[PDB]
Symmetry: C6
Subunit: 232 residues, 6 copies
């Protein structure tokens, strides 16, 4: 089977959607849409009755809710329903309001994984987003490989299908070799104008579009154009 | 979302209304691209609108900053006496004033002092010139430094600009995590095209709003910066 | 003698196939089809009476079996008849040890045990074909050791009459590794005019002449298909 | 805002009047781009204008510097004995007779600064050259920023306008101005060009202008531009 | 000046007679560019001309080198038994841990390496020597490359030998300056096609072709074409 | 300023008279570009104009070096005897502590102190007016931070004794620059010897990037290496495409 991202054009680009248990790496530079994209993935997940967990390391949950809320995505209700979770692995990297979930020390991936399996259990999560995974090893690159594979085993085991968001200043040291899929979002200046484009570089378990497709970010999120191709 | 008007000709148009309230905007660019003049113009316009502002100086002493702003027609003195503007001296300490940061070993005193200045004048706009100096010899501390300041500023209702210094040639914005941690990124460029340096601005990122995706030329004048939303740079200036 | 990969087009491109006992480095970036190519190589071998061994360092043998099954390649039958074997050199890398697997390398910090289990596996099934996916994981965090490791494994495998494929992960071909192996086959995925095109090229192959051209190929439901009579210069 | 005339042919026009008083200007370029001749002509024209100048030597011994200048027709001797010109020796302490101003330890700029303050005070200097400031931190780049900022404050606070020579093979953000001298090979020929990247306090030509080094120093052509690899206009 | 004929078709002509005797020639190139074959051809042809030769192996065990040379019709067995050819084993020591007349037990430094080499040159009155590859002697200690190349050079030239130092380059200090000559072998992809070329970058003691010449590797070794040149494709 | 004539065909013209006295000229380029040959032709011509030269050898033994210059029709034997020419052995110490015969020998290259000691002594016994250090790169290649002081220290020495010199600088093939931060700003002159593949052919060319004290050709001139030495063509220009 597959997992329908719900993101206009994407499921057609993946020929049906993301294969189950697959951990997809969404990489790209700043402002390419990785945040809106992965949030949309989870949001659409909810509308289809699929449990979702957002592991934030870049922003605090109260902030994430506000960002999504501005696109017309109110997770608060589902949060009360027990169909959506927000894991705070953010306040730990900046200092010290509680939450159902929180990682106090990311020195090790141990507590990180402990708290993760909890949120998955409580809502029987199906969809998961780690934004971002880069923060777990940016200053400890040799440990990236083990970290990516370990989180992978855990998620796939619980039947979850994942987007790891990778921040790029390549796709990210075994990281791009460890994941099942790779979707790169690009923002390129062409003839004096910035053009957004998406391309599925890798996707274990399926055939997929081999073309670079433009896309726009709108008030209601991302919209990819499967019938169009952008030439850089 | 509510917008903060920069007042800089062309910029609020380019931002489809202005900077979304509480956004931290990274103003990135090489030397002599107009980043300092731009950030000060942003603060001055705020004052004219009744929005108290703070300029955290890490590149020059506040005394010189006041002098330089005055030459553009921006005398902050009348405002400092009204408790509507403030200069934080985070410069002196770098090379051995109501607001002073004595030690930049840790970001702790920097924050305490910034918080002090914020409540003192009911600040709405803040400028840090420049953020790079806070970790340029501490690259690994950049991420947490940017994320901690951002939290303090948005948490106190401020809308800010973080000036980011990049060395000429590099199209970077500031490095790992920093360009990822800010809410917006406005790049000011100075490119040599056919034996001529041309200035241009481009909004690479701005959370909470759509914005022009084109590279617009601009000039630095006696009255500050002026961006031209109706012109684009495609290896040469052209209308629309 | 030639070891036939059985992968459509490959053997013609190798003018017969891989010279026996050769260690071939299969290099490429992520998603270029290296795992599938090497597994297809083992599969075809089983189909022609040649025992094979897949040494996993990137995935657990269980998932590998699954993955190969989706392509129509069920090894389970051969595994019980002593014709195929998976070597778990993965778990040690993550941490878990909560399962039973015949061949398993507990510690990857030394190539000593790795070679022990490999020798035992080759002994047990009389291995003729061996795949290591990926050798890169064995020295990524020890590049100065890569040279010895490649030549060491090279001596073992070749000594036991095995012909092997070492999968190399590229983010060149890998310092001194590209020199240690007998052959080099590069799998590429390049964006040309807004579209990703898959291609293969034989850079090196001690023991034989071979196509000096870049050939397009496709990954399908039944695996890889390479086109010997087609060439991808650049664009078409 | 007052202007300091470099007196170098074409340069003041390009700077739209001259260097804004008290500005520290970084003169950056690779070897043999003309940075030393330029900075020395700057001081010379200054002297021949009643403006006392100091040349801080970190690359050659003052004795040799005096020799290089005289060869172009700039004899500082008369001006030096008259207390209108001064040479600072911060060269010897870097590798191994008599010189009025000498910096014994370059470990850190404190002594460097003191000797510099003395020379300025002593001749009431108006122009100062540091050839080259790169040498003060070539092995300690993390110190470059503070050093540049410290010297800038000392010089500006004393009313001097300076040129820091930067040898290329937060510094550029710290100085007030930046003039790049280039030497590029185009069609089998080496062409010299100058370009003002930045100059706080004023507007200036935004073009790359060609120049020649002659027996009498540098001549820049403000009415010419170097575009592809050709001199146009 | 006295010349040493390589015997490789086209080479001696490109060298205007051949290698100036007593010269050390660095044969540099990436993987699969034909450096081993070229070097071995040089020695084989040397034997056929009554010029004893030595091959210092650091990449493969002398056993395998013998069998690979035979693969091209170069059976050194007849000459060795007659004290005309020698195989130095400076390989096994490289991967830790068989009798070989000439073996180097410690590569930690090159004193022993020089001893063994000195012994072999004397025993056979060697006139041609090949070291494959000299890169392995300092790959992990770049700073020592210069002195090692200069030391080996003084010893070889001191014994009247003419040599070829094979240098392994991946993809792209003292070394190239320390040798007498430099012959680069390349393998480049142009328009979906891999093309082999040789160019004499330096050869002390003589003039030589200043052009890049294409060449082929066959079942009988290398063949260089002095009448062809690579502007970018093969032209006249 | 009196010019030291190189004698090398076409060079003194390109330099508009020759090399300004006391100038330390860095001659750099990749392997096989003709730097050693160029430096020797310089000392040789220095002899014929009745000018005493020294050749500091760090890449070859003085015996081999002599055996190399002779191969070009340059026999310095008669001059070493009249004391009009000297050769320094700074090669052996680089690859061992072995003994041998040579009037001038530098035993330790850890520091440049002895080097100068021996050099000043060598300049004295004869009438050292021309000097060649080949290659200066060897002095600091493993300790790049020392390059600057080493270069300037040797400069002062030679200039202080009225010597005009060439420092041979070895750069790797493909490397653009001349020896890095230190070397290139500290020398008075820089002459680049290039060997570039243009249209399937290697072409030799020279270009003067810097020469304090004089004007000079600003163009790239082709040249040939012959059995008699180097021949640079001042009236020809090579166009590399860069
Ligand atoms: N309403 C909107 N209309 C069009 N574009 C928008 C709108 N809101 C936000 N954006 C775009 O979304 C971008 C940010 O996307 P995001 O996923 O947060 O970036 P990143 O890849 O750094 O995580 C902004 O830079 C902006 O260009
Ligand atoms: N009065 C003026 N008229 C025109 N241009 C000016 C004027 N004043 C300053 N400038 C320009 O402004 C530039 C400096 O802008 P600034 O923001 O200080 O640079 P940076 O981005 O490094 O902080 C100068 O290089 C100069 O070219
Ligand atoms: N059923 C299929 N049909 C066509 N292509 C497929 C199919 N299944 C997988 N693929 C392709 O195989 C690719 C993965 O190949 P793989 O060998 O795992 O990559 P890697 O080089 O990283 O080891 C996927 O990215 C996908 O494009
Ligand atoms: N009399 C002269 N006529 C023409 N050019 C000269 C004359 N004297 C020196 N030059 C040029 O000056 C250059 C050196 O300039 P200089 O300022 O010393 O270089 P740098 O940028 O390294 O400090 C020489 O390389 C030479 O080309
Ligand atoms: N019989 C043959 N006919 C044609 N080419 C061959 C033959 N045998 C080997 N080759 C070629 O020789 C190459 C290996 O040459 P070799 O000298 O071993 O490479 P290296 O430069 O890495 O030492 C192989 O990659 C192959 O393409
Ligand atoms: N008799 C000759 N005729 C033509 N060219 C020669 C002759 N002798 C040597 N050469 C050339 O001289 C080159 C070496 O010059 P050299 O100065 O030794 O190089 P480097 O710059 O590395 O010191 C050789 O590569 C060769 O091409």
């Amino acid at each position: 089977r597959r997992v329908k991202t719900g993101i206009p054009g994407v499921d057609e680009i993946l020929h049906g959607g993301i294969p189950e248990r697959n951990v997809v790496l969404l990489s790209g530079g700043p402002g390419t849409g990785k945040t809106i994209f992965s949030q949309q993935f989870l949001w659409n997940g909810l509308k289809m009755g699929e449990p979702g967990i957002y592991v934030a390391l870049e922003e605090h949950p109260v902030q994430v809710r506000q960002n999504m809320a501005q696109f017309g995505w109110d997770v608060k209700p589902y949060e009360e329903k027990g169909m959506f979770a927000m894991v705070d692995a953010f306040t730990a990297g900046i200092g010290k309001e509680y939450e159902k979930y929180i990682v106090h020390d990311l020195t090790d991936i141990r507590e990180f994984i402990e708290v993760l399996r909890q949120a998955i259990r409580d809502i029987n999560a199906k969809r998961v987003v780690v934004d971002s995974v880069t923060t777990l090893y940016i200053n400890k690159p040799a440990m990236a490989r083990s970290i990516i594979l370990q989180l992978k085993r855990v998620l796939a085991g619980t039947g979850c299908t994942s987007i790891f968001v990778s921040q790029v200043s390549g796709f990210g040291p075994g990281v791009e070799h460890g994941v099942d899929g790779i979707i790169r979002l690009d923002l390129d200046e062409i003839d004096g104008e910035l053009k957004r484009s998406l391309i599925v570089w890798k996707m274990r378990g399926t055939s997929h579009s081999m073309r670079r497709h433009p896309f726009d970010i709108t008030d209601k999120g991302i919209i990819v154009y499967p019938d169009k191709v952008l030439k850089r």
